[PDB]
Amino acid sequence: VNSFSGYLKLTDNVYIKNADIVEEAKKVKPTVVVNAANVYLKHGGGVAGALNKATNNAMQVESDDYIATNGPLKVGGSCVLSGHNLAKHCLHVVGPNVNKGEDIQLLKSAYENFNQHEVLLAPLLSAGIFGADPIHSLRVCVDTVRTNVYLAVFDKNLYDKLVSSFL
Numbered sequence: 112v113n114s115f116s117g118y119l120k121l122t123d124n125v126y127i128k129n130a131d132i133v134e135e136a137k138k139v140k141p142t143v144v145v146n147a148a149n150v151y152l153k154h155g156g157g158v159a160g161a162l163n164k165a166t167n168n169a170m171q172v173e174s175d176d177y178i179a180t181n182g183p184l185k186v187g188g189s190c191v192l193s194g195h196n197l198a199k200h201c202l203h204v205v206g207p208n209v210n211k212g213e214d215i216q217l218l219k220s221a222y223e224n225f226n227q228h229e230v231l232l233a234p235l236l237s238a239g240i241f242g243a244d245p246i247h248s249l250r251v252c253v254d255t256v257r258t259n260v261y262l263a264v265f266d267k268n269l270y271d272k273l274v275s276s277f278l
């Protein structure tokens with residue numbers, strides 16, 4: 112039993128809700144919140160910009176030190192950093208950005224990072240400003256993630272379409 116509330120159950124391990132991931136994280140304080148990161152951990156907009164804003168820029172400060180030490184992530188890769196006031200940990204995961212021409216096949220590799228964590232609060236990878244089809248992202252999530260994932264979808268219209276079209 113966990114504290115996630117109001118989710119629709121899609122499969123044995125995948126759950127979904129129309130919610131602002133920032134507000135959801137502040138309420139649940141999950142062990143892991145997933146960020147929709149880029150390879151530079153520049154949290155400018157989308158989910159990343161919102162999460163970072165909610166940390167009062169502490170996420171960005173920590174991220175800049177991470178990059179200075181380690182260099183950029185790979186597309187499809189991840190790193191674990193602090194969750195600040197939102198979660199114990201933040202798993203920064205880089206899905207392919209279609210608006211940069213990146214291989215959509217890397218979306219499966221990106222979701223594989225979730226399997227290293229027993230329970231996660233997450234957005235749909237490569238959705239939103241990353242330019243991929245969110246219906247496809249949900250399909251890859253369900254077919255790749257085996258651990259317990261709670262998906263927050265900000266847009267109510269999109270949430271209803273994802274549920275109604277789910278096979």
Ligand SMILES: CS(=O)(=O)c1c(F)cc(NC(=O)[C@H]2C[C@@H]2c2cccnc2)cc1F
Nearest residue numbers: 131132133134157158161162164165239265
């Ligand atoms: C007062 S706060 O600082 O805690 C704070 C905050 F800075 C930002 C947000 N959410 C936002 O910006 C959503 C539009 C951002 C979004 C979410 C999910 C996917 N794509 C975009 C909520 C907060 F509660």
Ligand SMILES: [Cl-]
Nearest residue numbers: 157158239240
């Ligand atoms: Cl977004």
